Amino acid sequence: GEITFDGIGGLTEQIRELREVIELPLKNPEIFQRVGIKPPKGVLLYGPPGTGKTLLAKAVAATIGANFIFSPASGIVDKYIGESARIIREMFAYAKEHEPCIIFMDEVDAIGGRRFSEGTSADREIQRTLMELLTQMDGFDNLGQTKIIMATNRPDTLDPALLRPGRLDRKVEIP
Amino acid sequence: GSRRYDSRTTIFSPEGRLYQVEYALESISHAGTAIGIMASDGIVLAAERKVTSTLLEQDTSTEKLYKLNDKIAVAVAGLTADAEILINTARIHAQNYLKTYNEDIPVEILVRRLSDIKQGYTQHGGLRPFGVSFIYAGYDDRYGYQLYTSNPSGNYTGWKAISVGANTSAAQTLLQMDYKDDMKVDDAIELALKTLSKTTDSSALTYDRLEFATIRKGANDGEVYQKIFKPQEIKDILVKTGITK
Amino acid sequence: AGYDRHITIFSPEGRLYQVEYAFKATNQTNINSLAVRGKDCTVVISQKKVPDKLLDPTTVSYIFCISRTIGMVVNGPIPDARNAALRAKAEAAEFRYKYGYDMPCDVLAKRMANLSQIYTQRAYMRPLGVILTFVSVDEELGPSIYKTDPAGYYVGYKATATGPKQQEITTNLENHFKKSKIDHINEESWEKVVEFAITHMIDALGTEFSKNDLEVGVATKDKFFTLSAENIEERLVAIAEQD
Amino acid sequence: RDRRERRLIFGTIASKMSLAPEADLDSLIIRNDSLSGAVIAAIMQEAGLRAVRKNRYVILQSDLEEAYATQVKTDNTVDKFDFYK
Amino acid sequence: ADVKGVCTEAGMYALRERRIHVTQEDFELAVGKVMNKNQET
């Protein structure tokens, strides 16, 4: 990460509760296996960008020694058969190879969101992208040494499927 | 600004009739049916009751059948709300005519006031038109029985059998065929009850899902005696025709 | 939702843009008020926001004297607060002229509630963003607090708080009223009630307050009076010299 | 869910993960009525994450209380929403 | 097509009860289900 996680201090509450959700299952998958509960799935950052939003995301990755991987959501918008399928999968595959890793997906309203009304106007490209995210999470596939982090200007704008546990269990606010 | 938040739709279409008026007609065709049959010894009116259930009071079927006069009654096709405003004004207009000339209002005279207001409603104010069509049942001592219809377009005609509300085409087609001018009240009722059956698709049709009235000569009057049937009286006539539906 | 800002139509939501934003914008003056009732008094204490040295510190008001008994605190922008104040003052006097009886809180609440509802129904007037806290020691209704909010909804309260720090104040009033097992203050002398009020206010808002940071209006049976600068000081003085 | 349905969720999710003798399943069924099945499964998940994060090897009744209080509320805005007032 | 649904549902009801014979009563219950299918969207 660009900075460590105690040099941005005065965001300390948010530091504290990102640290115990994200760092601990990566370092110690064993405690969550031994209890018999699931490792955590997804974590959400919400609030304006640069409230020290960007800091908190870079900073959790440094301490783990994860790679921080910034994905532009629009680029996940190729206009070819399965290109869109291909890209998501490959990040997930790479997350397990190069483990631990943070897959940071910025804006989830160019590949997700609640749309105009979720009809067809060119809102099926957006619907294909979100469907992919939802199928891997809910299914036989899982998140263990792949952590996915969603970022959104305001959290109310996100599909209620994403708001279920088993997609996003951790939801952090940035005041 | 707010001088451009005007809907500007109570102006003409190129189709020869106002936007809102044409659209309103659709609304009628999506609400209850009224059927008007003019006979040679009565006038028979049938209407199929829109929602019937136990949660409703089923013993009431004056929900669309109002008598405006002693010898004039109307049938509603459209919504309750829209109707009430014209009903009340027709009632008063009846009383103004009665009072001025010492005689009861002729059916066309009454029709004509209601129709000039319906037109009015779009002609002054910009406001929206009605969503009601009436079929008028009345007697006058200058033409015999008269049975008319008016629409929110302000055009009216007289007919010997007509239907308005939903399923106008189907009912009208059957009516033109079985029509006679030697029919009696009871022959008409039987006829009416057949037509209604052929437009409603059911296992059975019940007496409380109908609103019925006939205006016959009577045997307590040389006038015309208006008989407003209620569910239990609908039940009786259903036996009498032997038409169970 | 609907599209309430361009035509006066409904939303399937039930609540319109005019109502929804009137709920929000009622604080931008950085204001907090509470009202408590004594056994036999009613006290209002309100923040007083004199932000400059170009202004006299006692022309800045937010507590209005509507009648001779009835007080009204308006939580809202100051033009809207005075628009409400003007109407309330006439209705209060007109009611006494015609019906021979001074205005009580609940009837003023009702008149204004009906007006606010009509201007939301209209397409030819705007409604206001005012929360009106009406207070008295009514002759038949006892000590009274009746608070209206924008919508045209109003209801009667034990005690109430207004401002962004409403929540902080609430937990202190709750704690007292449960402890004592009554929904009014056991005390019965308006001094001791005023003093108590301030105590719970310091605690909630986290700053010790001066006389020029407070403005006090007191209601008693058959009279309403405002407490002056010296008067506020006398209360404050004790809270600073006890633990 | 029916009341009997509610009972199953508690029983099934508690097998998969640690439990406290303090924590009684019997307790849970009585406390939780009038809720969607989706909400109950959430709380049960939450309590197990919380307990481990709290660096333990057991789910206590205490984490379960805290997770319950968390999931049921997310709104704390009053004196609004006219259509029922 | 709805009529074809009535036989396959009548039979499913019989199947659930482990019967190769189907009464009139199951057939009525099947038709009511089929009517609800036409009402959707």
Add this chain to the structure above:
Amino acid sequence: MTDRYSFSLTTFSPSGKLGQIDYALTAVKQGVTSLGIKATNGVVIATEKKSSSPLAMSETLSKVSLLTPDIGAVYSGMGPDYRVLVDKSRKVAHTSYKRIYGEYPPTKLLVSEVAKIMQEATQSGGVRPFGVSLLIAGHDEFNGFSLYQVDPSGSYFPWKATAIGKGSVAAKTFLEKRWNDELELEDAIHIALLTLKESVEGEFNGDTIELAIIGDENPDLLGYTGIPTDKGPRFRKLTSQEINDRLEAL
């Protein structure tokens, strides 16, 4: 100023719909549970009166209004809309039947008046309907006991038993079985309590429930503690204590 919105704010389409009304009908559903039973041995109305803040009292909140001494009304929807329409409903009941005709209004004819106001505020431009539905319950020698609903549409209908607000479909259903033609007023108070118990729990006590009846009354409050000219009005609304006491024997 006026004269900027003189087009109606309901308009039609080929589906015949009236924008304002569909939105307003939704509002009624989002109210609190209010119900009406005609037991054909009186009329019983019950509704929930509920806090919206911990320091809001509920004994300053009623949803039961008297329209006239012997016609009562209950509602679901927007609070303000109900009070303002209620003032106007009161106005016509008092001036036009008790001075002109010297007596209390007949319910059905009062149902016609209240409907006409609501339909009127839709027909006239620049203003919207009221976003409520009222149940107007009354008694007269001539008509018996009666119950009508008047919609936000300005349509009306009579209903043997009905419910509106939250949990409408289930509340009406359970009720229909428990509703007999010949039903005892005490059992009919229990059924109402029972229904409202199914909508709400954890804040359901009898002193937050407001129930009023058409049938039994108190002459001693109608100025007939002394020798009567007549018995007088049949509506009498319960206090909280009476409600709680019966809730124990539910």
Add this chain to the structure above:
Amino acid sequence: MSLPGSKLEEARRLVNEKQYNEAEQVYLSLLDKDSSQSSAAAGASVDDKRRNEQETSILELGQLYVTMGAKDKLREFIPHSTEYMMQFAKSKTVKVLKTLIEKFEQVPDSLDDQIFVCEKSIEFAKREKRVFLKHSLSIKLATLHYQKKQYKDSLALINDLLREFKKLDDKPSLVDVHLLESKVYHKLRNLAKSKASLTAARTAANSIYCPTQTVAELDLMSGILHCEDKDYKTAFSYFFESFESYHNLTTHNSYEKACQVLKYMLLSKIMLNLIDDVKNILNAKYTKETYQSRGIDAMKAVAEAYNNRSLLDFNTALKQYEKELM
């Protein structure tokens, strides 16, 4: 005496002050006296109002009667007294008849005497036009046969009644006969049929409102078929829901009824092999109600004996607790 009201109070208190035997001479006296108007309605007095009070008095009397053994005169008396009520209200006759029969079997009774009241009653009704809920009473009539160990006979009677409910008579009557028919099948060990009939019983129940206790009986059978066809987890859950319903009914659900369901509730958990939860069900008094019996003792001894895996320990418990237990 010489007033209906005063003599109501007196006749009832005569039981309490000493004994029933004194009271009965009073009750018997209520019949001769009082009334100078109306229709015959005690076969010793003409009356309206006295007989109307007599209904509630007869209703008390009859409960005590089963204890007394004096029931036998009442078993005849009720069918003679039906016609008293036809000359009042038809609805009252139907109503009264059902409540009096319900009281006698709520107390323990011999069958022979029970069969006998009902029998006359149902034949007599038929003659007029009253068929309304004499069929409901035939469902009750099945029930005495069921206990008698005339299942085979109950079966014949039940089959005809099913047809009547299903398009010639009342919808709620249907649920109750499907419930009984499930208990009947079960005893013949026809697991297959008992199960299929409950599935029908539930579909019929959710169409309507079914009394609170009835809903719990439904849940009891479901749980029972899942101990015999396994799936003890699912059973347990139902026994939870059913036990809670019996709790809430209080003393309007018999003492004995609540205990047999608890006995099954403990037993399912031990098979399910969560024994420590059997200890949690005991140690709670909201989930046992302080119902302790030899039956209940047995289930804690059996859980203990399993943990120990001592065969000897099971044989000791079984025999000692036996009479209550099996």
